[PDB]
Coordinates of C-alpha atoms in Angstrom, one line a residue:
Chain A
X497 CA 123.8 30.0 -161.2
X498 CA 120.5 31.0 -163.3
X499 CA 118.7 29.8 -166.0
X500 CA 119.1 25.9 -167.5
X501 CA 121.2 23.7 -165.0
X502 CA 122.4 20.3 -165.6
X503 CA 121.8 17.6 -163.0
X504 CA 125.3 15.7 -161.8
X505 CA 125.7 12.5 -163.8
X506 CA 125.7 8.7 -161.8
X507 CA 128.9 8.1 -159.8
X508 CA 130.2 5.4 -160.1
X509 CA 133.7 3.3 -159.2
X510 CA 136.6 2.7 -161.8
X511 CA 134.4 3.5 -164.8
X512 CA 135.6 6.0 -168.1
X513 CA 132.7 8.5 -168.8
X514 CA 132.5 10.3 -172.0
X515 CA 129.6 13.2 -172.1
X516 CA 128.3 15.2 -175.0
X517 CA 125.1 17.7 -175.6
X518 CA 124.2 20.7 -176.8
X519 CA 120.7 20.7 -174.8
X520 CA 122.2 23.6 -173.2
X521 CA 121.7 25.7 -176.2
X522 CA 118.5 27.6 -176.5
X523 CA 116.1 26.0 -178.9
X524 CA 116.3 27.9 -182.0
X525 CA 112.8 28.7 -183.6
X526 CA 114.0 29.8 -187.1
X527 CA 116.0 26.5 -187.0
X528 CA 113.0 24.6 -186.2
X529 CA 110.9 26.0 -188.3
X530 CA 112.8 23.9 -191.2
X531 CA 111.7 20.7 -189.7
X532 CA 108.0 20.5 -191.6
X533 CA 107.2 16.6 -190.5
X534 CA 106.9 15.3 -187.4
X535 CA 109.8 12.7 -186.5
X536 CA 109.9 10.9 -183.2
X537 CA 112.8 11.1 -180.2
X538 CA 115.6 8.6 -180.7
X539 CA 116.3 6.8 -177.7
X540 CA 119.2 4.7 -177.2
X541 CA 119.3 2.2 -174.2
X542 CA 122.1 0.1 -174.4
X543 CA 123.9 -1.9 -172.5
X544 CA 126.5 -5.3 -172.2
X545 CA 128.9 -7.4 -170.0
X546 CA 132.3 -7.1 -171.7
X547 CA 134.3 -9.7 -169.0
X548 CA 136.8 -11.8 -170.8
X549 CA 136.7 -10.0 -174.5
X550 CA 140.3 -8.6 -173.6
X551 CA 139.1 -4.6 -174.7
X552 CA 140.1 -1.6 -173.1
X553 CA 137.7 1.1 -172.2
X554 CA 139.6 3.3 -174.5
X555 CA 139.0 1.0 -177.4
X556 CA 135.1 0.8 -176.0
X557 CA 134.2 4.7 -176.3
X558 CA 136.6 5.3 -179.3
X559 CA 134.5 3.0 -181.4
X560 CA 131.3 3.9 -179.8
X561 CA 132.2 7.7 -180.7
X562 CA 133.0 6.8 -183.8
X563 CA 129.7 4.7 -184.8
X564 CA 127.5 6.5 -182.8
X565 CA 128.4 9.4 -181.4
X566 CA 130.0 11.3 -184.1
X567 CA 128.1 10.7 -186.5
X568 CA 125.5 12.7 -184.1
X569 CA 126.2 16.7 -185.2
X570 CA 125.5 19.8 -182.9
X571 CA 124.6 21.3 -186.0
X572 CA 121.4 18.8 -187.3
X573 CA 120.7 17.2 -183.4
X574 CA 119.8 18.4 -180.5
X575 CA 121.2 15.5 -178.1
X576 CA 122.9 14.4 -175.0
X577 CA 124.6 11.0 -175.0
X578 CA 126.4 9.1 -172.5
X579 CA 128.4 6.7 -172.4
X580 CA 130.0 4.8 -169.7
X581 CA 132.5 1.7 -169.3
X582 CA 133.5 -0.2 -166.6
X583 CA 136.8 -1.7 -165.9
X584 CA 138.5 -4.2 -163.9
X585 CA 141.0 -2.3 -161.6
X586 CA 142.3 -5.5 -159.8
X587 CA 143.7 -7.2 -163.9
X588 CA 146.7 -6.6 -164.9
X589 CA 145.7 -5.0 -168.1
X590 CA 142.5 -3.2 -166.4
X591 CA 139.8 -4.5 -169.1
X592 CA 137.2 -3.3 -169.8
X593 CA 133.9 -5.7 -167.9
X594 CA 130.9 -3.6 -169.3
X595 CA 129.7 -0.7 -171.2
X596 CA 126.3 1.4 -171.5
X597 CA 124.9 4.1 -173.6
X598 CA 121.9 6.3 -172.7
X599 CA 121.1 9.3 -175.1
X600 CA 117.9 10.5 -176.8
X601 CA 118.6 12.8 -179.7
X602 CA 115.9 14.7 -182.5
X603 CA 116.7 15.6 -186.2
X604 CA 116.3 19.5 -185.8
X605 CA 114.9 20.1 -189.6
X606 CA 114.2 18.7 -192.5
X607 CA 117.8 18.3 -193.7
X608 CA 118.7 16.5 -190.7
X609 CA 115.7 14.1 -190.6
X610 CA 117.3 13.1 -194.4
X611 CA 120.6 12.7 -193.0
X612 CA 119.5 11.0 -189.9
X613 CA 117.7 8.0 -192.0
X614 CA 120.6 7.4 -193.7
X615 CA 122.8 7.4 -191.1
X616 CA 120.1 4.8 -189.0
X617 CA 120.2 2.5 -192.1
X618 CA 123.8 2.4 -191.9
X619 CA 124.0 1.5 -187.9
X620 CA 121.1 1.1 -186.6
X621 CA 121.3 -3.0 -185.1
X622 CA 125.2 -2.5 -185.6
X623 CA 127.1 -5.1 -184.0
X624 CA 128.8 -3.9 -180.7
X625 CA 131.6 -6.4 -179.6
X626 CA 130.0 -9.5 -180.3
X627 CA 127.9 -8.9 -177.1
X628 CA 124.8 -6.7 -177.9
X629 CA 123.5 -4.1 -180.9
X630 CA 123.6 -0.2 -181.5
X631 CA 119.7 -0.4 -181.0
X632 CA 118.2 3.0 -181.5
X633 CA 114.6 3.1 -180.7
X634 CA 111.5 5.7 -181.6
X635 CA 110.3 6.6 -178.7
X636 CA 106.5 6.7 -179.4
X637 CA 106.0 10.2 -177.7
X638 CA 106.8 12.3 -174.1
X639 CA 105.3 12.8 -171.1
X640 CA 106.3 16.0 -169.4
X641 CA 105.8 15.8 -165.3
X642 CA 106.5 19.4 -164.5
X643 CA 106.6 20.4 -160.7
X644 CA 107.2 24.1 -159.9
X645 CA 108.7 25.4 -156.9
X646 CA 108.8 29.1 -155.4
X647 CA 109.9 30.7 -152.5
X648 CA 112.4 32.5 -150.7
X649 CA 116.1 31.9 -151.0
X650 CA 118.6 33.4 -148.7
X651 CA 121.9 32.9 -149.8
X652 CA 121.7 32.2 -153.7
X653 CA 125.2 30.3 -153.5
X654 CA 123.3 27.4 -151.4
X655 CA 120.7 24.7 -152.1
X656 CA 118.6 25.2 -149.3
X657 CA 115.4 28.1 -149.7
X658 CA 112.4 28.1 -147.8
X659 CA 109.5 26.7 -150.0
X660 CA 106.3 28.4 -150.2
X661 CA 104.3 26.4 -152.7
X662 CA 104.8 23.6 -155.3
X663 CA 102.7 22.3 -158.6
X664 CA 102.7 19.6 -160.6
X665 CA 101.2 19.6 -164.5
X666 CA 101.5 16.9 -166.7
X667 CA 101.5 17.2 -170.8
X668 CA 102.1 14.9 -173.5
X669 CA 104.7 15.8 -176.5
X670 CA 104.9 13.7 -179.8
X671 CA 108.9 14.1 -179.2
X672 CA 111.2 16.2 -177.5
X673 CA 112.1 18.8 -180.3
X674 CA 108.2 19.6 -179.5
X675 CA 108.8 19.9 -175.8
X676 CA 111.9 22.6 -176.8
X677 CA 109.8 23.9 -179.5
X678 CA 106.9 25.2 -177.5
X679 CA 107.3 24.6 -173.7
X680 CA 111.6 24.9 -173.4
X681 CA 111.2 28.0 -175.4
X682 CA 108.7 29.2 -173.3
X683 CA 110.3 29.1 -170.2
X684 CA 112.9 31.2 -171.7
X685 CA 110.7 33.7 -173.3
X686 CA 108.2 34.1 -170.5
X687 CA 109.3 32.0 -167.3
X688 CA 112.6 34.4 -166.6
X689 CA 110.4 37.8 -166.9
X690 CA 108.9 40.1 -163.8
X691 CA 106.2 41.9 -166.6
X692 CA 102.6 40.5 -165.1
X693 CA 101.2 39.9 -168.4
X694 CA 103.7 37.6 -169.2
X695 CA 104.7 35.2 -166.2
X696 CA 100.9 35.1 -165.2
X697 CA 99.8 34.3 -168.3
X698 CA 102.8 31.6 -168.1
X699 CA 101.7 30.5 -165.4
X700 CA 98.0 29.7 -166.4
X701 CA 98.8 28.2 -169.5
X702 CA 101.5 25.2 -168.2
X703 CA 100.5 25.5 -164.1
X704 CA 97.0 25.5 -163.7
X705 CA 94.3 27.5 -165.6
X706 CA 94.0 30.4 -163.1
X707 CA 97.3 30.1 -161.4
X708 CA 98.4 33.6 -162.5
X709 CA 95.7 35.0 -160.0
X710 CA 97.1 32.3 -157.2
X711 CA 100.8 33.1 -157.6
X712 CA 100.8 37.0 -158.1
X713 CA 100.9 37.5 -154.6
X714 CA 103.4 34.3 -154.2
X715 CA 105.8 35.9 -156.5
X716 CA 105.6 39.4 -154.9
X717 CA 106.9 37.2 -151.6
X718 CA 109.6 34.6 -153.2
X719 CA 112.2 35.7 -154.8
X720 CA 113.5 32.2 -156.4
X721 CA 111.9 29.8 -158.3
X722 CA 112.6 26.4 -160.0
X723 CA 110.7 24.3 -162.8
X724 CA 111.6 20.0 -163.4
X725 CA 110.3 19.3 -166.3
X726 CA 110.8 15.6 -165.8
X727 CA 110.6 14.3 -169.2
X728 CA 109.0 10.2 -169.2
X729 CA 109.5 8.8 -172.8
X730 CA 106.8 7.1 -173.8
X731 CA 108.0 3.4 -175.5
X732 CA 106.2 1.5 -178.4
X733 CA 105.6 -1.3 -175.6
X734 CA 102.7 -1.2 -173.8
X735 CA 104.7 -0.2 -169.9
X736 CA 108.0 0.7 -171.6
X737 CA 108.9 4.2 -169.8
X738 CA 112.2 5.9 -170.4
X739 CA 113.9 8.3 -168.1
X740 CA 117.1 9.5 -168.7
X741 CA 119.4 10.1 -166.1
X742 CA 120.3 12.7 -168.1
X743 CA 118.4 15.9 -166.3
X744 CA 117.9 19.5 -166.5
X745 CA 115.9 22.0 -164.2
X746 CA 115.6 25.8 -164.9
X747 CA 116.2 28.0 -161.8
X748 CA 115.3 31.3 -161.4
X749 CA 117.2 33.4 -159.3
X750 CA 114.9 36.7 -158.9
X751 CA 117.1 38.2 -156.0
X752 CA 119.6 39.0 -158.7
X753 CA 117.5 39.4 -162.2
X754 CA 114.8 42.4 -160.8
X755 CA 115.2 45.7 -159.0
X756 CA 113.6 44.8 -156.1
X757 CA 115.3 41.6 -155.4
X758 CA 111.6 39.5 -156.0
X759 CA 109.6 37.4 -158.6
X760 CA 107.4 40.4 -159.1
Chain B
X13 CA 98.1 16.5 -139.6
X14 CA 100.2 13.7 -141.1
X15 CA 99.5 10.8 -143.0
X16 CA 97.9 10.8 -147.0
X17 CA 96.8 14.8 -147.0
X18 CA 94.0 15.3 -149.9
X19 CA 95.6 18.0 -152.5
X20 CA 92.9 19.6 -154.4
X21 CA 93.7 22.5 -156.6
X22 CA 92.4 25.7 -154.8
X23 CA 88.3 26.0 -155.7
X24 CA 87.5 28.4 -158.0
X25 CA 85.3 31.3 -157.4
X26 CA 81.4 30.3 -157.0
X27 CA 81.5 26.9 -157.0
X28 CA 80.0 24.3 -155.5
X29 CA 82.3 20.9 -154.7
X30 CA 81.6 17.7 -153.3
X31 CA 84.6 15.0 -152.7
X32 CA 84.4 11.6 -152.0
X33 CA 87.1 9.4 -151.5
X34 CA 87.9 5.9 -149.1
X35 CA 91.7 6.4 -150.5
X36 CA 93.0 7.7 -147.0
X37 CA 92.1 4.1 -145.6
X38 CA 95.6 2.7 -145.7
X39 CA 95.7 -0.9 -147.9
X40 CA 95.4 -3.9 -146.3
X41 CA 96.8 -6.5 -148.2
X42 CA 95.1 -9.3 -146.9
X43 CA 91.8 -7.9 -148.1
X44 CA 93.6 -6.8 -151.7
X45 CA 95.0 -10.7 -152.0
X46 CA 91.5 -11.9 -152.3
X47 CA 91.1 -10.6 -155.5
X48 CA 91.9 -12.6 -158.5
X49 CA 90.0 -10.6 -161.7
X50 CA 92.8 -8.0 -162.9
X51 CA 90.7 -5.4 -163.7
X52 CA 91.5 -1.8 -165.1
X53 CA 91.1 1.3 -163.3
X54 CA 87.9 3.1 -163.8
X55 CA 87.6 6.9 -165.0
X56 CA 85.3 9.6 -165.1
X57 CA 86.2 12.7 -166.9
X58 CA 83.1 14.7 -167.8
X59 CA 82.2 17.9 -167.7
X60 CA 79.4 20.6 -169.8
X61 CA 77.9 24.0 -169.8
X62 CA 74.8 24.3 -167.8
X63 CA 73.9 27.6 -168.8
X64 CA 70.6 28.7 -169.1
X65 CA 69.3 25.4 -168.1
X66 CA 67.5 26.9 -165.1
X67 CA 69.4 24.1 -163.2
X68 CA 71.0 24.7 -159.1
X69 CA 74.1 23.2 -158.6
X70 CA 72.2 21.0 -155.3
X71 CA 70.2 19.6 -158.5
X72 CA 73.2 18.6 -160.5
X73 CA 74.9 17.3 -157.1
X74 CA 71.9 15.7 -156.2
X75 CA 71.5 13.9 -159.4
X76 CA 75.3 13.1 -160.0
X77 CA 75.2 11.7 -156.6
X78 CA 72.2 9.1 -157.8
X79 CA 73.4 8.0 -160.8
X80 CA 77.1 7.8 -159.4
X81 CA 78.8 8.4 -156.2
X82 CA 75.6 6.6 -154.7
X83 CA 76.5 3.4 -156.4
X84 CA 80.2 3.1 -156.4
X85 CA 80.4 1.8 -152.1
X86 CA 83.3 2.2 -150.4
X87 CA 83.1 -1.6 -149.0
X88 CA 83.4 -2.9 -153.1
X89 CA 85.5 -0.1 -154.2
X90 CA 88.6 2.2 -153.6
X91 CA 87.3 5.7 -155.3
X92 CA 88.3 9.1 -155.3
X93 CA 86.0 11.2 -157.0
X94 CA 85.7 15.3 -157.0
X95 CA 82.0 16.5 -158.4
X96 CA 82.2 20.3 -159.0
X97 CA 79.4 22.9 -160.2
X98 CA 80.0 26.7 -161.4
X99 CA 77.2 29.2 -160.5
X100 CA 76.4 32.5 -162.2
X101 CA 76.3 34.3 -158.6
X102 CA 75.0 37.6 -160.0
X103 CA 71.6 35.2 -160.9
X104 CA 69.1 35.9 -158.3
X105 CA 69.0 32.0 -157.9
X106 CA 72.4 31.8 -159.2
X107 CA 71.9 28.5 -161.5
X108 CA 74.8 26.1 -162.3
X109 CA 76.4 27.0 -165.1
X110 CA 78.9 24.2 -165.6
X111 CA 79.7 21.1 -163.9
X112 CA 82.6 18.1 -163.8
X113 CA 83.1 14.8 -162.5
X114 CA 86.1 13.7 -162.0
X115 CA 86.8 10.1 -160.5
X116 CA 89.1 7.1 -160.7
X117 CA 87.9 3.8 -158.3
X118 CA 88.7 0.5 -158.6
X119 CA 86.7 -3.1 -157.1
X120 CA 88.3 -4.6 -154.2
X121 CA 87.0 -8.1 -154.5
X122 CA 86.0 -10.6 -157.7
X123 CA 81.9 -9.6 -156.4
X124 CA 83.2 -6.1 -157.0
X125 CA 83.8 -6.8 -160.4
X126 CA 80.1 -8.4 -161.2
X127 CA 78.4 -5.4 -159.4
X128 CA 80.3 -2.8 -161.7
X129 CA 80.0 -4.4 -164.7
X130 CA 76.5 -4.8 -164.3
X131 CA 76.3 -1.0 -163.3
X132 CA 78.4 -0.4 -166.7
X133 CA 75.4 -2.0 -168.5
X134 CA 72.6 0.0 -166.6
X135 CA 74.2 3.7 -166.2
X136 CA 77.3 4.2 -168.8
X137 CA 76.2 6.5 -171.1
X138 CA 73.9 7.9 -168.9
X139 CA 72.0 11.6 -170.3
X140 CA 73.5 14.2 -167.6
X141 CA 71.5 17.3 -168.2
X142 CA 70.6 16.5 -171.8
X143 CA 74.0 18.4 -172.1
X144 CA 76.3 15.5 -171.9
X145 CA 76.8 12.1 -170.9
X146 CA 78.0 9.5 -167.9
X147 CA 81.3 8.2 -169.4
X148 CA 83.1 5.4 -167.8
X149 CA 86.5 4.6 -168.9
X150 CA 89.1 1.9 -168.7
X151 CA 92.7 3.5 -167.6
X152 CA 95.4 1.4 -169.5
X153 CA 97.7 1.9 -167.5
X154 CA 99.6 4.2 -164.8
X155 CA 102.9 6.6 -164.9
X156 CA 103.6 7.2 -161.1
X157 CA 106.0 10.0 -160.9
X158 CA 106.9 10.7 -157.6
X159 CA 108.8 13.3 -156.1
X160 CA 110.2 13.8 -152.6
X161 CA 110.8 16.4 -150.7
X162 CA 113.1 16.5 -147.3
X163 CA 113.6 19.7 -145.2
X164 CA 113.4 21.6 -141.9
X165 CA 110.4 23.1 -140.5
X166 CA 110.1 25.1 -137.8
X167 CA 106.2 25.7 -137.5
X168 CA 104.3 22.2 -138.2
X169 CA 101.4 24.0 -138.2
X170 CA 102.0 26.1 -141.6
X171 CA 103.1 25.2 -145.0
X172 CA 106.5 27.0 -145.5
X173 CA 109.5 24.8 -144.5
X174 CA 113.4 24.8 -145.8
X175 CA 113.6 22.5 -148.5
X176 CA 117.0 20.3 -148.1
X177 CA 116.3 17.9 -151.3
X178 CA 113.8 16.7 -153.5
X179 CA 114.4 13.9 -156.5
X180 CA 111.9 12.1 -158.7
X181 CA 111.3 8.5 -160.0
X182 CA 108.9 6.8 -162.1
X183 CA 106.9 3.4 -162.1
X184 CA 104.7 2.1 -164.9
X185 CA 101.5 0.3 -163.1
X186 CA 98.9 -1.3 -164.5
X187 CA 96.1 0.3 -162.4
X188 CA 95.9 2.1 -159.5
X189 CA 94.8 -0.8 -157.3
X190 CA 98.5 -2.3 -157.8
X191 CA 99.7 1.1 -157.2
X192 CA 97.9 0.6 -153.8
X193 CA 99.1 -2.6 -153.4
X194 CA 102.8 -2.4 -154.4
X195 CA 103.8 1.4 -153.5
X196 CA 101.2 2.8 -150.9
X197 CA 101.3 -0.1 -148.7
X198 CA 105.0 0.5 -148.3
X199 CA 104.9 3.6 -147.6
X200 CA 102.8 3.3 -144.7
X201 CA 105.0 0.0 -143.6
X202 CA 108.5 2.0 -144.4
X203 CA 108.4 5.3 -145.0
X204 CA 106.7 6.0 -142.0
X205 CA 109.5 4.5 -139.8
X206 CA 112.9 6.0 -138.0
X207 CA 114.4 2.8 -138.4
X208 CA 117.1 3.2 -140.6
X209 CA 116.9 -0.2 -141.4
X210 CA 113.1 0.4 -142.9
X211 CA 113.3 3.8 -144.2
X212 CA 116.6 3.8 -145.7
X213 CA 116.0 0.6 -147.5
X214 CA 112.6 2.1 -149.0
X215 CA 114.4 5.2 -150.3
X216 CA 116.8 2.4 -152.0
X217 CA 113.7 1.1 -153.9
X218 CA 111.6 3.8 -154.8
X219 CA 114.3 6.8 -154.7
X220 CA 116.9 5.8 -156.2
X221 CA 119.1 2.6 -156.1
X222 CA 121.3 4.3 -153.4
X223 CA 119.3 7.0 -152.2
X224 CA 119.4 5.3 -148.2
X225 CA 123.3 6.2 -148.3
X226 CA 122.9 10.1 -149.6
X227 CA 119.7 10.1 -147.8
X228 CA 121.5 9.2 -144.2
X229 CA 122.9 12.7 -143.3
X230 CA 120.0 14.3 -144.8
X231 CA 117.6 12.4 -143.0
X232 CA 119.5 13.2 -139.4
X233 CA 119.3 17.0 -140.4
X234 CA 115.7 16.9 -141.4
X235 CA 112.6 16.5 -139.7
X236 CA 110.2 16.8 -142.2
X237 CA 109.1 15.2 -145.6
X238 CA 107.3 14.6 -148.4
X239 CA 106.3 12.1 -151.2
X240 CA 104.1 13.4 -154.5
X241 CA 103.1 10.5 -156.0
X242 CA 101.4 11.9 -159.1
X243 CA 99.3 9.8 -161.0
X244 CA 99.1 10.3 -164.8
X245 CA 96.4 7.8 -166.4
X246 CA 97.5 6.5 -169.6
X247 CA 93.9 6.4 -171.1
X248 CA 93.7 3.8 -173.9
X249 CA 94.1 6.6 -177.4
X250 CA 97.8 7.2 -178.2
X251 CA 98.5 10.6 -176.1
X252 CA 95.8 10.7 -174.3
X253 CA 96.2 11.2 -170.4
X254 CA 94.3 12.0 -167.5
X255 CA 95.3 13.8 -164.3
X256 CA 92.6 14.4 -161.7
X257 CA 92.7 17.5 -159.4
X258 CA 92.2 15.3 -156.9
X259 CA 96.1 14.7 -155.5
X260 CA 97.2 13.3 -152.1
X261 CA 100.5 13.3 -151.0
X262 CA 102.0 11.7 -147.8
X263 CA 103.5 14.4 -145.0
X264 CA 105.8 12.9 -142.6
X265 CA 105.9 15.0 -139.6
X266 CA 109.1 13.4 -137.7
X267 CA 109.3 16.0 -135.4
X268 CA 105.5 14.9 -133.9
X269 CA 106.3 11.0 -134.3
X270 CA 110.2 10.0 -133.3
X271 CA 111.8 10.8 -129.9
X272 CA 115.1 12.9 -131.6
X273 CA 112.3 14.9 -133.4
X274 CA 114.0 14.0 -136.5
X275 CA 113.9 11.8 -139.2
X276 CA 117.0 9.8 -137.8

């Protein structure tokens, strides 16, 4: 209802899904705080036609989870990983005809970054059915594109609100375990409060330099917000962009957090 | 008002702006074809403190205008370009304190070219004020991320409306003259159609890959939209961007323009 929410992953016919993250969790600071080197995002972008190599989808994700996924802990990675394979409904035997995996993942300390090289000298290139490679790629940095929205919402268990105003800023990350370190864990700390002196200031430092003055009578009206961070990896390739489809957005439902059912 | 709407940030308090732009002129892609020198997008990002200088801000308009806006014509380039000076308004001649340009432009035509690069050679680096100088810069590149609002207003003459839906997506360009070419072009030829056999098909490019099928009912119980196109420069320095104040976005007003008075 509040806070982080999750955007539906792509539909798609007579395909096995498997999901996993734990980007849901609050970003830890003490945790972080044991990370003392800056390590780029891992993005993996991978994809292959399986027609005709007689596996079944099962087989597909089990030894993807086993090489990949797995080896990929809630406890040393923030991460969310999917991975989809798509059958043939119409053969007897309902093959497998293609699979794909789409998941960017940081080391969340020091520790981790030791396991994690060891781990990518292991599989990183691995052979994956004869047809393609585990290929697990720095991402050279992030862009955040960040719109805000505010206004009024009346019923909080529907989509639709009446939108008063909308913003865009735009910031560049060396990874995203820097985009939870200082903007996620922002949002959390400052984003979901109704004291002045900290959503204005919140507002001026990722919004727009003076848009605490420009939204304190905006949030005294609305009484729901949402922030997309829309987060644009940054390749080594000169016009290599990564978006997952893997999205979050924050919403904030005021009407039910503060006495008198607004933003302020 | 529909069509490409100018988005500024709201102006400060005591200041002084001057905005020039031949961006609301829709492409025409006969004229664009007769180019055949790729050249980057040009940048100006500069700003300084004026204080105590004894300058007025109609002096540092004035003299931006000659060394710049003067010599960047709307018949060899497509420009957008904000100029902006702060005042000290308890001065009794309240002097400019501060000042920024802000402009990206790019030549229309191979002549174009020769006239700017020839204006590179006489004005870059050009002392503004003895405070800084005229910096013209080569964008490498262009992350488009454009988001898209659909919804119901009830007054076209105010800002508030119910927001239905909004989504994202993201295009690498190399400058903002293929950006023009490519993207705004078809939005004038698609997205400002009822045809469901133009409109429907341009959500399916630039939406999402079947955005025209979701997009159906909610285009039938809509009559009003939006697209953000924001333009983040990817400057030439690792992690270094540029996003100009200067926004536009594109309001559809269906309930103005098609006989059903929405956007189906």
């Amino acid at each position: 209802t509040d806070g982080l929410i999750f955007s539906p992953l792509p539909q798609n016919k007579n395909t096995v899904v498997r999901h996993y993250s734990n980007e849901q969790e609050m970003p830890n600071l003490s945790q972080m705080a044991q990370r003392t080197i800056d390590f780029p995002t891992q993005i993996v972008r991978v994809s292959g036609n399986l027609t005709g190599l007689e596996l079944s989808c099962d087989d597909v994700e089990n030894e993807i989870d086993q090489v990949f996924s797995k080896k990929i802990s809630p406890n040393l990675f923030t991460y969310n990983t999917y991975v989809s394979c798509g059958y043939d409904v119409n053969d007897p035997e309902q093959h497998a005809i293609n699979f794909s995996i789409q998941s960017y993942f940081d080391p969340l300390t020091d520790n981790a970054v030791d396991y994690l090289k060891s781990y990518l000298k292991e599989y990183n290139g691995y052979n994956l059915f004869n047809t393609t490679t585990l290929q697990i790629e720095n991402a050279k940095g992030i862009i955040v594109s960040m719109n805000l929205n505010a206004g009024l919402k009346s019923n909080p268990d529907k989509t639709p609100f009446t939108l008063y105003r909308q913003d865009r800023n735009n910031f560049y990350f060396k990874s995203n375990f820097d985009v939870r370190k200082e903007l996620i864990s922002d949002i959390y700390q400052r984003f979901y409060s109704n004291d002045p002196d900290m959503i204005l200031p919140f507002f001026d430092k990722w919004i727009f330099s003076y848009a605490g003055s420009v939204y304190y009578s905006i949030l005294m009206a609305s009484n729901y917000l949402e922030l997309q961070p829309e987060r644009i990896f940054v390749m080594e390739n000169e016009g290599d962009i990564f978006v997952s489809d893997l999205r979050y957005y924050f919403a904030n439902l005021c009407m039910k957090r503060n006495p008198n059912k607004h933003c302020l």
